[PDB]
Amino acid sequence: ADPEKSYAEGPGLDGGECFQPSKFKIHAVDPDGVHRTDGGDGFVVTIEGPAPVDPVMVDNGDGTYDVEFEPKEAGDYVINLTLDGDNVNGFPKTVTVKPA
Numbered sequence: 001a002d003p004e005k006s007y008a009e010g011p012g013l014d015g016g017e018c019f020q021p022s023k024f025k026i027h028a029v030d031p032d033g034v035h036r037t038d039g040g041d042g043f044v045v046t047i048e049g050p051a052p053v054d055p056v057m058v059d060n061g062d063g064t065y066d067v068e069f070e071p072k073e074a075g076d077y078v079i080n081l082t083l084d085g086d087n088v089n090g091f092p093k094t095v096t097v098k099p100a
Contacts, residue, residue: 002036005029006083015095018071026065028083035063046080074099
């Protein structure tokens with residue numbers, strides 16, 4: 001599968017500010033020169049923090065999925081991105097935002 005070629009990166013999740021739009025795109029790659037049979041990629045991503053719209057993740061079905069959350073005060077972000085049953089080396093981490 002893609003337990004070694006799954007990465008998510010975006011202009012969101014950097015934290016720093018809560019009034020900044022948080023959105024990133026995830027890209028999985030399996031041993032077929034694809035993102036693990038597009039459409040059926042075991043990609044589970046999840047973000048959350050001290051806000052109302054914390055859990056926001058969607059899949060487009062093109063090997064790349066997007067996730068977006070947007071807080072309105074001071075908060076830290078905890079990420080969750082998994083493609084096989086484990087998380088990427090930058091998702092179970094927590095980013096921090098100050099009092100926007």
